[PDB]
Design a protein around this ligand. Structure first.
Ligand SMILES: CCCCCCCCCCCCO[C@@H]1O[C@H](CO)[C@@H](O[C@H]2O[C@H](CO)[C@@H](O)[C@H](O)[C@H]2O)[C@H](O)[C@H]1O
Ligand SMILES: CCCCCCCCCCCCO[C@@H]1O[C@H](CO)[C@@H](O[C@H]2O[C@H](CO)[C@@H](O)[C@H](O)[C@H]2O)[C@H](O)[C@H]1O
Ligand SMILES: CCCCCCCCCCCCO[C@@H]1O[C@H](CO)[C@@H](O[C@H]2O[C@H](CO)[C@@H](O)[C@H](O)[C@H]2O)[C@H](O)[C@H]1O
Ligand SMILES: CCCCCCCCCCCCO[C@@H]1O[C@H](CO)[C@@H](O[C@H]2O[C@H](CO)[C@@H](O)[C@H](O)[C@H]2O)[C@H](O)[C@H]1O
Ligand SMILES: CCCCCCCCCCCCO[C@@H]1O[C@H](CO)[C@@H](O[C@H]2O[C@H](CO)[C@@H](O)[C@H](O)[C@H]2O)[C@H](O)[C@H]1O
Ligand SMILES: CCCCCCCCCCCCO[C@@H]1O[C@H](CO)[C@@H](O[C@H]2O[C@H](CO)[C@@H](O)[C@H](O)[C@H]2O)[C@H](O)[C@H]1O
Ligand SMILES: CCCCCCCCCCCCO[C@@H]1O[C@H](CO)[C@@H](O[C@H]2O[C@H](CO)[C@@H](O)[C@H](O)[C@H]2O)[C@H](O)[C@H]1O
Ligand SMILES: CCCCCCCCCCCCO[C@@H]1O[C@H](CO)[C@@H](O[C@H]2O[C@H](CO)[C@@H](O)[C@H](O)[C@H]2O)[C@H](O)[C@H]1O
Ligand SMILES: CCCCCCCCCCCCO[C@@H]1O[C@H](CO)[C@@H](O[C@H]2O[C@H](CO)[C@@H](O)[C@H](O)[C@H]2O)[C@H](O)[C@H]1O
Ligand SMILES: CCCCCCCCCCCCO[C@@H]1O[C@H](CO)[C@@H](O[C@H]2O[C@H](CO)[C@@H](O)[C@H](O)[C@H]2O)[C@H](O)[C@H]1O
Ligand SMILES: N[C@@H](CCC(=O)N[C@@H](CS)C(=O)NCC(=O)O)C(=O)O
Ligand SMILES: N[C@@H](CCC(=O)N[C@@H](CS)C(=O)NCC(=O)O)C(=O)O
Ligand SMILES: N[C@@H](CCC(=O)N[C@@H](CS)C(=O)NCC(=O)O)C(=O)O
Lengths: 146, 146, 146
């Protein structure tokens, strides 16, 4: 609970960001008069909608990776990346909402942040498994010698 | 294990609920003959589909908050909120499926439950970080006095 | 911290798999020239898109279940199901990409693996709660007897 509080903070922040995104769709729904069963309408609504939707489907990836990296590599490092990602995503949502062009730059930023997290989580897992593995590997070569 | 079992239960219940929503869409797909690559068709299907999709995208928000709140504030209180949310969501799904008007009321219900969870997670996190911060704050203004 | 390392590993693998599906959509987006605000186009694109979207919405269900089962029943068993599921999903994505028919077989495979995990998680939670409940139940029926 001590070594997880930073993670949980970034997590809650992320949830708030997602809640913001979905509030913006609800607003763009009134603004551009697009009725609830409808997913489609004026391009400015559609861009806002699609941004929220792209952000929503990546969220679980962010969460999973945040925690895995935070626990197996470094809480502080993971939390910082999470922050960078979350911020990049806000920029993505806003760029996309303007033009389908202005989402590209922030998307790449967020992709890097997320890849970094994946990289950390990967090392942290290797650091965990590789020693135990190499030990069991060498034990195989020692049983032969004796 | 003992301090998270109630959370895990509500989590599993939520998973089941989502599984239900999913099965309903598969049903309404046969019922209204809407073939797999198509996301669109009769209003009856689209409402069912969109309800599941709305429920699906909030689910990680619910999970994230449920656990952060459960762990940092109170397992029982979080778990009870989760239950309230999950029920409200079931109502939302069924209301929406009838008319895009009948989803509104339960949506608000679910939004409240989810916001409360966010609030609890927020308090719990403040309670964790605040004293240690006030300690360091006093240490500063105490450097002055001494 | 390490009675969860296998879980964390299957989790990260899952994230990578989703990262893969997302990249595949990005690719099919250029390949069939479908501009970003648009969700719709040639059936070849739509199938790839829909696959990624179906995979993405079940992902949180997978994660939630994987961890709850892994923690309350057995880490190795959960992780193995996770692996089966993940692989089944890869096959789903690929089949769906070719034809909306070739998705069905792997979908069922994935559905089994996922239900199995739900089953394990359910038992594990029963094993935790059910002793105490049946005991209180017998006590009640025993208070009557004596
Ligand atoms: C942290 C969790 C919170 C996540 C965010 C979810 C918050 C939920 C709050 C619900 C607010 C929605 O508010 C509601 O929106 C719907 C569409 O979206 C509007 O639309 C509604 O009224 C219009 C009238 O113009 C009808 O034509 C339409 O069929 C009906 O759906 C309502 O006028 C508005 O009252
Ligand atoms: C919703 C509010 C979000 C607040 C999120 C908090 C961000 C905190 C990031 C911490 C910065 C990381 O810095 C790390 O800190 C830990 C704390 O012991 C130590 C490490 O040596 C250091 O590298
Ligand atoms: C470099 C390769 C050397 C291999 C030796 C590693 C020994 O592996 C050690 O196993 C014990 C189990 O009792 C635990 C430690 O966390 C782990 O590091
Ligand atoms: C510990 C609790 C376990 C909960 C696990 C969660 C799994 C979810 C399963 C709950 C199913 C909900 O139960 C649902 O009730 C409604 C009643 O309005 C029924 O509603 C049905 O009949 C009515 C007519 O009476 C129709 O208007 C409606 O279109 C139709 O769906 C559904 O047939 C049933 O599926
Ligand atoms: C910094 C601390 C973070 C923890 C916050 C915990 C909040 C718990 C209290 C729950 C009440 C929140 O209630 C919610 O408030 C926000 C205010 O931004 C409203 O949101 C409204 O303002 C924002 C401006 O930022 C608009 O983008 C949005 O379109 C609009 O609807 C929601 O319509 C309302 O439902
Ligand atoms: C302006 C008015 C604002 C009002 C705000 C009110 C503050 C709300 C904060 C409540 C959250 C406190 O979070 C509290 O954390 C402690 C951690 O020590 C938990 O305590 C738990 O773990 C500790 C170990 O440290 C055990 O000793 C204890 O048996 C157990 O219950 C409490 O279950 C939880 O209630
Ligand atoms: C929680 C998991 C929910 C996953 C949702 C996916 C549902 C898949 C639809 C199942 C329909 C049953 O389809 C049938 O399955 C059985 C056993 O599985 C086999 C048959 O060849 C197949 O025709
Ligand atoms: C707490 C509940 C846990 C149940 C555990 C059972 C797991 C074994 C799998 C069988 C579940 C049967 O679930 C059934 O699936 C088929 C095919 O997908 C459809 C039905 O609508 C659904 O009711
Ligand atoms: C998958 C099936 C799971 C069903 C679980 C059913 C839940 C049963 C409710 C049990 C509630 C007990 O709540 C208990 O409260 C006491 C208060 O002194 C404390 C314990 O940590 C907590 O476990
Ligand atoms: C009853 C159904 C059988 C499923 C039980 C499986 C869970 O078995 C669990 O093992 C772990 C590992 O030491 C411990 C738990 O206390 C125990 O409940
Ligand atoms: N769901 C995404 C998968 C790939 C992706 O994240 N694409 C990025 C870069 S093209 C995007 O901005 N998607 C636009 C959107 O989803 O609306 C999609 O359909 O495009
Ligand atoms: N994805 C949602 C984001 C905002 C939201 O959650 N909207 C609520 C209130 S308008 C809703 O019931 N959406 C209808 C739907 O998603 O089909 C949407 O497109 O509407
Ligand atoms: N979101 C799903 C919910 C139900 C589901 O998972 N359907 C399966 C079996 S029909 C599927 O492969 N859906 C195709 C898709 O989502 O593109 C849908 O709309 O179909």
């Amino acid at each position: 609970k001590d070594e997880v509080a930073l993670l949980a903070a970034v997590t809650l922040l992320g949830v708030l960001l997602q809640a913001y995104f979905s509030l913006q769709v609800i607003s763009a729904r009134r603004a551009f008069r697009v009725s609830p069963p409808l997913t489609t309408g004026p391009p400015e609504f559609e861009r806002v909608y699609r941004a929220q939707v792209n952000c929503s489907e990546y969220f679980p990836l962010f969460l999973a990776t945040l925690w895995v990296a935070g626990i197996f590599f470094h809480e502080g490092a993971a939390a910082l990346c999470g922050l960078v990602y979350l911020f990049a995503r806000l920029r993505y949502f806003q760029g996309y909402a303007r033009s389908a062009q202005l989402r590209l730059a922030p998307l790449y930023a967020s992709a890097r942040a997320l890849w970094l997290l994946v990289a950390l989580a990967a090392l942290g897992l290797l650091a965990h498994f590789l020693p135990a593995a190499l030990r069991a590997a060498l034990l195989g070569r020692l049983r032969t010698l004796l």
